[PDB]
């Protein structure tokens, strides 16, 4: 006869909320540690290697299947060595993604920038093609030279897009597009 684990609150009657500046970093958090010395992560790596070796033992030495599983084992070892620098909890051992904004191992800022640049490239290439091919024929029938021209020319999307936004050539005036006014606004 017992309840769920009771958590302890802060009876914060002092009238101030203190945020520790030194705790605003992954290295200063007591629930996540680097994967290198995380015992649970090391156990996970050992279990993975043992399972890979057991799978390898099924196939005889020198066979193509043996070589395939051996390459898998080498890939797993290299992946473990790379992940030793990640951050993985203290009880799970699974490497975590830090989405605070700190530029750290396994962070989000660099992947976010790379994705945003790539997809702004995609969207600006498509928009440029639609602007230079204002025709359904050229939409169903891709003008491959012009399409690839737009695709390779959209590399400057972050600056050209902002220039068009600030110069009025990007957005359209609300009085010039098909906007929903059926309520007779």
């Amino acid at each position: 006869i017992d309840t769920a684990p009771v958590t302890k609150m802060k009876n914060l009657k002092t009238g101030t909320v203190e945020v520790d500046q030194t705790k605003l970093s992954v290295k200063s958090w007591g629930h996540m540690e680097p994967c290198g010395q995380n015992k649970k992560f090391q156990k996970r790596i050992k279990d993975e290697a043992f399972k890979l070796k057991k799978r390898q033992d099924k196939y005889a030495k020198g066979s193509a299947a043996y070589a395939g599983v051996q390459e898998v084992i080498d890939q797993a070892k290299d992946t473990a060595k790379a992940y030793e620098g990640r951050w993985c909890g203290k009880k799970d051992g699974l490497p975590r993604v830090i989405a605070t904004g700190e530029v750290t191992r396994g962070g989000i800022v660099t992947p976010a920038l790379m994705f945003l640049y790539t997809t702004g490239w995609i969207g600006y290439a498509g928009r440029s093609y639609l602007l230079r091919t204002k025709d359904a024929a050229k939409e169903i029938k891709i003008d491959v030279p012009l399409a690839l021209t737009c695709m390779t020319s959209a590399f400057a999307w972050p600056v050209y897009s902002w220039q068009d936004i600030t110069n009025g050539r990007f957005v359209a005036k609300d009085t010039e597009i098909r906007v929903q006014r059926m309520h007779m606004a």
Binding site: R55, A136, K141
Partner: protein, 162 residues
Amino acid sequence: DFSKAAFGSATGLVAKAASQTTTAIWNLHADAHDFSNSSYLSKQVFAANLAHIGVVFIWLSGMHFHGAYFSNYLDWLQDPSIAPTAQQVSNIANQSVLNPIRVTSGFFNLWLAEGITSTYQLKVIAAFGLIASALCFLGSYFHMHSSTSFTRVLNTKLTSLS
């Protein structure tokens, strides 16, 4: 000419403003094999059937090719109790766990019922299946583009067909 007519459906789709919608694309797909009534309907049907036969021959050739190269057919012959696998899986991403896929199509039992004992025979069958698929595609082309109308096969020549 023929290449121009290959995208003729798309050209007709873009020709009229009424067909410049995604609904037109979905109709173009839905009405793909709906061969409209015309003087060449039977030619179209027979050529489509022969093309499908060629596709099935491609499939059979691929299955025999996997049996020849990516299968433990010989080991299964030496011991039928083992798991019949005929699809190798390359080590990309992390899919290496399922590298031998136990095929359950019964091709090993079928081939044993056909007297096939060597993977060379499976290679030969795959090659001849590709040849048969090529012949079926040639025949389908021919019938669609240069052959009899076939309009008599269901009413007039039904006795001969049956």
